Each structure stands twice: as C-alpha cells, then as structure tokens.
Amino acid sequence: GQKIGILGAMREEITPILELFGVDFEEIPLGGNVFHKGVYHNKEIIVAYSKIGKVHSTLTTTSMILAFGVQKVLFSGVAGSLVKDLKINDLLVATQLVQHDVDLSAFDHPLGFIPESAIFIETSGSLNALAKKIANEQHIALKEGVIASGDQFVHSKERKEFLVSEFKASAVEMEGASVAFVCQKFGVPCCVLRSISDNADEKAGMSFDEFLEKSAHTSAKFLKSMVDEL
Template sequence: TSFKEVEDRHITFFKGDISGKEVALMKCGIGKVNAAVRLSELINIFAPDMVVNTGVAGGIDTEVNVGDVVVGSQCCYHDVWCGEGAWGQMQGLPLYFDGSRKILDIVEGLSLDNLHTGLICTGDQFITESIGLQAIKRNFPKALAVDMESAAMAHICYQRNIPFASIRVISDTPDKETDNQTQYFDFWETAPKRTFDVLKKVLEKL
C-alpha cells in the first residue's frame, strides 16, 4: 500500500488505502485538546465517512489484561464536572458518546481472542495507581479501559454527526499486583500489530 503525505497547519496526514478502503491517517498526539484539534483538521480536509481511533489504554476492569483489545461501545469523560447533571457530563451533551453500531457489529462477529466491547473513559491523566482507578470505577463501574483521547474524538464526531469507533489495546493494568510502568513499556513490540489487525479486519468488512 502506498501513501501520500499531506502537510497542513503543522499536522502531517497520510492518504492511501487499507483493505481496499480509502483512508486518511494522522497521529493525534496525547490528551483531549490535541485529539480534538487534530481530528477537527482531518475532518475539515478529508470529510471522512467515519472516524476510527486506535491506540493504547489502561485496563480498569478485572476481565481485561495487558495485550487485550477494547473497542468502545461508548466513551465518556471521567474528569469533567459542570455542577449540574451527572459526573463526566458537559451541559448540553450526552454523558456517553455511542460507538458506531456498524463497527461494533463487525467487531462482535470477529473470531479474535481477548477482544472486548465496553465503556472507555477519557481524562487528561495517566492513571498509574489504584487510587485513581478506584475513583473512576466509583463513577463508572462498567468501564473497561481508560485513556486520554477517545471521548474527545467521540465528542467531535457527535457534533459533526460522523460515526466513530475507538479501538484500544491494553497497555497496563493499574489495579493489579504488577509494575504497570514496566507493563506499559514492555508490551510495545506487539501493540501496533494487535490494533492494526483488528482495524484491517473491520475495514475488510465495511
């Protein structure tokens, strides 16, 4: 597959095809603002039919382990409080941003081990200790994973009426009796291939 490099406003995009589907790729950077700004630029330039975000996340449920893949059936903020409504909800917006039903149906039909669908929580924090994880689980007991970008991108797609999905490989598990910093750095050899394999299978079936 060949890709064409496109530079715009200090952001590098790559345009090409994967599994016969025309795609535009970018690195969104770390955190909610980077993700929102860069995705907005991508949408303005390429007008995609749907947006799929891939990356890593911390596992915050006993059923997920390092190397597992979580696809967000919903995404939400875990660090937002506006004084009214539910914790994590911005006024005028839903608490939960739904993932693309079409992509979720495809994912749930794949014969892949250690693949989960569920809630991904987003905040501008790298969760390294169980105390932070417990606070998130208290507000969102069904959450499977925590990251720093998914809900921000889901938020943008909700406002633009664009289907969105987040595919995250679990990099560490802060609440388990392991050194999660070591987990995070040790798994990188397999993480990119794991998420790309899922993404490729999804694109093949779209």
C-alpha cells in the same frame, strides 16, 4: 468508494498501520499534523497520529472531517485496564465513552457532565457489529465496555477505583472520548479499538513501556481486518 479516517495517538500506534496496508502514502501537513493519504482496495484512507490528549485528538479529528471529508473514523491505540477481567494485549471496543476528568460539581452537576452535552458518548452500532463479527471469525476474544478518557495517565489504584465506581469504566485512555464526541457532532460513525498495555496501577508506567509496541500491533492488525470488509 468511501473515505475512511484512521487515527492513532502516538507515532508508534500508527506505524504498523501504514506497514500493514503496505500501499504508497502521500503526506499532507496541516495544523501541526501529518496526514497519510493513499488508495487501498478502491477505498481512500487517511491516516495520522493526533498526539496525546483531548485537545490534540479533538483538533486532529475535526481536521480529518472538515478538510478530508472522511465518512468513517476508526481509532487504534492502547489503554489501561480497570478490571481483573481485562488483561495485557486483550482487545476491547468501546460502546460508550466518558471524559472522567470533567468537574463542574461546584454547580451541583454530576461528574463528567458539561451543560448542553451528555456524560456518555455513543459509538457506531454498525462498526461495533462488524468488529464482533470479524472477532468471532478469527477466534479473537473481543471484549466490550465503557472507556474513560482524561488528560492524565492513570497510575494509582485509588483513581482506578473511582473510575470503575463513578463510571463503570472497563478501560482508561487519553483520546477516545474526544474523538467519539467530534464524530458525533458531525454525524460521522466512529469506532474506538484499544489493546491493554497496562493495569493503570503504580506499575503502569513500567508495563506501558514494555508492551507499547506489541499492544499497538495487535490493535493495528485487527483494525486492518475491519477495513478489508468495508
């Protein structure tokens, strides 16, 4: 009966989702994005890839909420690990997200902070609960943690160190925080799932190209298991 929004950042991240669902999808173009609207097990699903970055992801999320009236938003994509304990292909659900590249330190504000806002953005307790459930049921080692989002692809131990110490982040990506933020402002529950594609180091660009498709499918697979339970 509900309307569920499903997002990815790149076409590659959403292709497996359209497949996995296997239904017929009507394509609606809006604001530079193409939304795939279809029916599935009595639930209306709207799928799309936002394109990379904060601006792109904010726009798409806002459009999905205001134009389609989605009641829940699930995000699927890949991310880079910042901890030894998070490996390639590992799955992770963000508990809190931060915009690691926000800097108003000149006004003596802590990094990541914007007036009239907060440093960390929370995600859905019920969706994250539902993720842990399905994770146990299928023997998947689902991890939890803070995700840092910024408009830079991280590829240096230096930046990695900063993210872990400053924000205690477990993974880094480029759209999580912006998607969760928009959903919070509209009172829409949000879930951010990510699969590790690299280790955000000097070799990050290499590993990313190698595992993009695999990681993308693992994440997409899990996200579908979640929708089957909603």
